[PDB]
Amino acid sequence: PPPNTKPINGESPLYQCDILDKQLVEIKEVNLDPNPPVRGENLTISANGEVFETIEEGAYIDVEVRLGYIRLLSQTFDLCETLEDNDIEGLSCPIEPGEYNIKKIVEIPGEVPPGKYVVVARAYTEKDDLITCLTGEVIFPP
Numbered sequence: 132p133p134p135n136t137k138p139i140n141g142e143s144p145l146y147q148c149d150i151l152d153k154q155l156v157e158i159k160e161v162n163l164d165p166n167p168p169v170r171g172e173n174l175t176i177s178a179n180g181e182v183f184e185t186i187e188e189g190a191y192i193d194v195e196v197r198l199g200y201i202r203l204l205s206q207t208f209d210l211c212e213t214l215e216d217n218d219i220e221g222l223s224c225p226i227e228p229g230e231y232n233i234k235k236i237v238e239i240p241g242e243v244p245p246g247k248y249v250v251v252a253r254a255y256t257e258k259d260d261l262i263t264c265l266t267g268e269v270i271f272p273p
């Protein structure tokens with residue numbers, strides 16, 4: 132497989148990246164209701180993970196979406212803000228250490244062109260400490 136990448140257990144194409152760098156959160160298991168997500172349908176995300184350090188306000192995520200060799204999306208979102216805007220139940224921003232189980236539902240735009248997309252997200256705390264690194268490949272049939 133790719134360098135510094137671990138498959139995540141479960142029905143998901145997700146990998147953990149930058150493993151040689153200490154990460155504050157362990158992503159134990161990830162499941163998606165359609166194993167390949169389907170355009171124009173709901174996608175259900177089940178996640179099981181651990182948090183080892185109190186995540187406080189100021190964490191941020193560098194998210195990059197890429198189609199082929201074209202860089203489609205690159206920006207930084209405020210982590211707490213995003214979890215609160217998307218109304219994740221139980222992810223109140225001061226994230227205490229512990230065992231977490233998260234279920235979140237998102238809708239896939241049907242308008243999305245068919246093709247092979249690569250997503251890369253790196254989340255860091257206010258102190259710029261690496262929380263996690265995740266990468267994935269999704270292929271949409273035409």
Ligand SMILES: *[C@@H]1O[C@H](CO)[C@@H](O)[C@H](O)[C@H]1NC(C)=O
Nearest residue numbers: 172173174235236237238239
């Ligand atoms: C799909 O998800 C949305 C988001 O909450 C929900 O309101 C809707 O009822 C769901 N529809 C189906 C068919 O699952």
